Design a protein around this ligand. Structure first.
Ligand SMILES: N=C(N)NCC[C@H](O)[C@H](N)C(=O)O
Ligand SMILES: N=C(N)NCC[C@H](O)[C@H](N)C(=O)O
Ligand SMILES: [Fe+2]
Ligand SMILES: [Fe+2]
Lengths: 338, 338
């Protein structure tokens, strides 16, 4: 079997999808502009019907950890070299594919960004940055990006995480793991369902990993409060036979002086490590990871820094934007609190 | 101003929408069948673009209590007489309009029903039943249907409640009320945000208001547990400047021996009563009430029982079906627990 739901575009379907994305890139100024954010869900209705059928059905299935779409053509010559930093990563060559990702994302829910991550951008970049190979963020390389729920600290975290591979010549794998329900005993399961765990915000929300001012953007103050004074939360929620998962390998901890909770988390680490599997996003592959069913990461790899490094576009998706209205910065689609 | 977001179909747009609904009625056996439940969201993409644009945008606005669509043609001759009971309310005349409601609903989210209400039907009926004029359910008439959040007792309650008026010759009004935030003092507001209120399941989930067996459908046992042993919950949730509302006028109460909570609920009753406004759903009008922003009801009216009584089709909608996977009866779209 495959733990994800997979769809392969025919050449005609992919060509049509790309043509629609090119139309949007031609007509709109940017993906994150208020105009295209509103229209993308409606424009996405013009995508190939077999893809729309897959996205509507696969989303409502109970089992898959991700929805994978293969076969989007990407011309390395037209794309150009991989950017050295995310700041300067909105290149004309990558523009149509950013619009394509937002169109696909529009079929699954409401796209949003974070005020404290990559300058409040909705469409974000994942690429290796020179100097930061051994960091705990997505711009790492030599150090493996440990498994985690995206923005695990926040209750306004995405339901789905979209990942479109612009290039990945050496086939570096995205890691994935579901809830290890076949190995979790009921006592450990009970404890994971209780609010006895501290999940702090990851390093992508730090001020150093955003541009120069930016800080002091008031939304960083809420990140500091989440890091300094994290309130206890549960790792598992909902149905015991198919729980939703909320955990971060490098930023989770038990409640202070709670050894029962600690033992449960320690056991969960072991079981997730042992059941971790690989998903290689080849050039043109799009993956929408179910952020509630699965944790994800990225394998360690040797960065090139020759202009052809692994490069993904990424986007956060929620099924309901009004869930996070407390975290609304303003009228924009950028979340964060004081 | 109007507290809801309104859209009027042009004759051509309405005709096209009706034609699409007729196509679905011709091709599918029923609305609640597993086939059309999966396909309706995709088929809804073929609706008029101006309507799809309205539904995508109006859903993401912060202010409206409901999304109202006017101007769907309904032929009283083709429709036929109003049913005497919901059991026998799936008439051939009302069939195309039931498909139309599910197509509109498909643009807003995932439709579902309740195992303990109207025999697990997704598309339900609202009509006056002889003998039950002074009941606390939607089939009442002479007694006003008091304001409430739909299925307030359940955490799996709908995000939107769809209401399509098949006929309403005497213009009986649907009542609506938002959070009375202009009158709620901060102390009362604080208490409403705390888990100090008991919300029991309404009478539509009782065994007497469903068909003969049915009982003992195991899902009624969870309703009994919710009625007998309700666990404390908050009336208001989320953002203090725009809270989500969870209350039932006839089935809410404070926590036992909690007079502070009682006073807050008592005050809330007064403010909702004083700010209650009317929305008349004329023949062909569709209303998608925001179940989190507003409570709703129906004004008292004298029932006719002459074959032309007020008659609505109704449907529950959630932004995410996986939110209620604990309450999944099976593979079907019908909720309820043991
Ligand atoms: N959660 C950990 N361990 N690292 C952060 C990875 C996340 O994907 C983060 N949004 C990032 O892009 O760095
Ligand atoms: N909540 C009160 N007061 N009555 C029940 C009305 C609800 O709309 C219920 N689902 C019904 O149809 O009777
Ligand atoms: Fe991530
Ligand atoms: Fe109701």
């Amino acid at each position: 079997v495959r733990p994800w739901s997979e769809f392969r575009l025919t050449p005609a379907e992919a060509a049509a999808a790309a043509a629609l994305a090119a139309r949007c890139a031609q007509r709109y100024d940017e993906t994150d502009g208020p105009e295209f954010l509103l229209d993308a869900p409606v424009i996405a209705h013009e995508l190939p019907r077999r893809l729309r059928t897959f996205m509507a059905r696969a989303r409502l299935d109970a089992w898959p950890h991700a929805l994978v779409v293969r076969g989007n053509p990407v011309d390395d010559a037209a794309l150009g070299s991989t950017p050295v930093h995310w700041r300067t990563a909105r290149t004309p060559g990558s523009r149509p594919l950013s619009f394509l990702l937002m169109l696909y994302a529009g079929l699954l829910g409401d796209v949003f960004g974070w005020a404290t991550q990559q300058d409040g951008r909705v469409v974000t970049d994942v690429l290796p940055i020179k100097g930061g190979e051994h960091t705990l963020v997505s711009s790492s390389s030599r150090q493996e990006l440990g498994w985690h729920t995206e923005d695990a600290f926040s209750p306004y975290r995405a339901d789905y995480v979209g990942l479109l591979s612009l290039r990945n010549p050496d086939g570096v794998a995205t890691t994935l793991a579901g809830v290890p329900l076949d190995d979790l005993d009921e006592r450990t399961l009970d404890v994971l369902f209780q609010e006895r765990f501290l999940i702090r915000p990851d390093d992508s929300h730090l001020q150093v990993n955003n541009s120069t001012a930016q800080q002091g953007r008031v939304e960083f103050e809420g990140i500091a409060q989440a890091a300094d004074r994290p309130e206890p939360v549960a790792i598992l929620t909902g149905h015991r036979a198919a729980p939703h998962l909320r955990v971060d390998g490098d930023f989770s901890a038990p409640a202070e002086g709670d050894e029962e909770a600690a033992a449960a988390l320690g056991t969960l680490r072991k079981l997730i490590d042992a059941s971790l599997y690989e998903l290689v996003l080849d050039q043109g592959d799009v993956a929408f990871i179910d952020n509630r069913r699965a944790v994800h990461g990225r394998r360690a790899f040797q960065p090139r820094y020759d202009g052809r490094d692994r490069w993904l576009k990424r986007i956060n998706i929620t099924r309901d934007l009004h869930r996070s209205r407390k975290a609304w910065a303003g009228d924009s689609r950028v979340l964060g609190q004081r």
